[PDB]
Amino acid sequence: PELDDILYHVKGMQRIVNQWSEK
Amino acid sequence: PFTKHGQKECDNALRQLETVRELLENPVQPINDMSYFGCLDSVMENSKVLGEAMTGISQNAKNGNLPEFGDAIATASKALCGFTEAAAQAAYLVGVSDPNSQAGQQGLVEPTQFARANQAIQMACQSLGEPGCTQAQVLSAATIVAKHTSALCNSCRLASARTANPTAKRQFVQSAKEVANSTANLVKTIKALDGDFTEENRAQCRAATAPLLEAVDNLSAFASNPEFSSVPAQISPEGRAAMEPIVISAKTMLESAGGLIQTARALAVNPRDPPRWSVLAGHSRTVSDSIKKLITSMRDKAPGQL
């Protein structure tokens, strides 16, 4: 891949993971 | 012809039943986080699905519909396994509720993916720290970090969901957020370092690896904490006696279902076999009778678990 796409991906993963329930 | 796929479906089902039968050998730990009443509903639902599969298994072997026979077999195997897990879980819950019993616990199993991601991320971060790394090297390290941290977060999500212990369930997800947050921050410093390779941007990109490596180490350490390791319960003699109805019925259903599938495997090849049709109906009768006896016993112990 390219650096721009890798940045988009980990930023989108961060948005999804930060909503995960811990319970 | 197309019998080969049906034969293999029967082999897979038989192997799978042999695997879930060990759950009944000596229940000394919970299988999952289901309540006694969830177990009740699960046994109910899975038996409905099994009853329709037994008719599909029988009709399609008689009528030579080999794809529909295979799919009935696959459906029955999944329902038998679901059934057995809920019965083994219920049995455990019955046995440890005796006041002379002592609780056990499921150990958390460590994903083998953890070790792979861990080593990969460390080498990628060590690369990003070399005082002379290039733009191509920085791109490859970012690619490796992104791929293995994404996989790490998903392993945490799945490990959280199958952990009954609430402290471990929470830590897996907190670790996932630590990994995701520090990865996002690291790739942002890589984005700046890219095309501006000063000692100052190298130092910052280097500094950004430390939180990600800490998250990864913290996660792999917690996975080894002794307080989450498997411990077998001490079921009292009165605990064992109380789980006997559930355990015996589950075993009998498994034994008979195994004999049913083994017989249907041959009838799918040559269905002109009256002796085996009568064996198969005998096994199917016992499958049904055992499910009735297990459900009946579970429904009757039920007030004690409210």
Numbering used by the authors:
A (entry chain B): 467 to 489
B (entry chain A): 1354 to 1659
From the article:
Talin plays a key role in coupling integrin receptors to the actomyosin contractile machinery, while deleted in liver cancer 1 (DLC1) is a Rho GAP that binds talin and regulates Rho, and therefore actomyosin contractility. Talin comprises an N-terminal FERM domain (∼50 kDa) that binds to and activates integrins, connected to a large flexible rod (∼200 kDa) that interacts with multiple ligands, including vinculin and F-actin (Calderwood et al., 2013). The talin rod constitutes a force-sensing module that regulates the assembly and maturation of adhesion complexes, and is composed of 13 four- and five-helical bundles connected by short linkers, forming an extended flexible chain (Goult et al., 2013b). The DLC1 binding site in talin has been mapped by deletion analysis to the four-helix R8 domain (Li et al., 2011) that forms a unique protrusion in the C-terminal part of the rod that is otherwise composed of a linear chain of five-helix bundles (Gingras et al., 2010).
For these reasons, we used the longer DLC1 fragment for solution binding studies and the shorter fragment for crystallization experiments. We crystallized a complex of DLC1(467–489) with the talin R7R8 fragment, the structure of which we previously determined in the free form (Gingras et al., 2010), and solved the structure of the complex by molecular replacement (statistics in Table 1). As in the free form, the R7R8 talin rod fragment adopts a unique fold where the R8 four-helix bundle is inserted into the loop connecting helices α3 and α4 of the R7 five-helix bundle. Individually, the structures of R7 and R8 in the DLC1 complex are nearly identical to that of the free form (root-mean-square deviation [RMSD] 0.35 Å and 1.75 Å, respectively), the main difference being the relative orientation of the two domains. As expected from sequence analysis and NMR data, the DLC1 peptide forms an α helix that interacts only with the talin R8 domain. The DLC1 helix docks into the hydrophobic groove formed by helices α2 and α3 of talin R8, forming a canonical left-handed anti-parallel triple-helix coiled-coil arrangement. At the N-terminal end of the DLC1 helix, corresponding to the LD motif, residues L469, I472, L473, and V476 are embedded between the hydrophobic side chains of L1492 of the R8 α2 helix, and V1540, K1541, and I1543 of the α3 helix in a “knobs-into-holes” arrangement typical for the coiled-coil packing, creating a small hydrophobic core. The negatively charged DLC1 residue D470 that is conserved within LD motifs (the “D” residue) makes direct contact with the positively charged side chain of K1544 in R8. The polar side chains of Q480 and N484 in DLC1 (positions “e” and “b” of the heptad repeat) make contacts with the matching polar groups of N1534 and N1538 at the edge of the R8 α2-α3 hydrophobic patch, creating a polar ridge. This ridge is extended by charge contacts between E488 of DLC1, which is wedged between the positively charged groups R1523 and K1530 of R8.
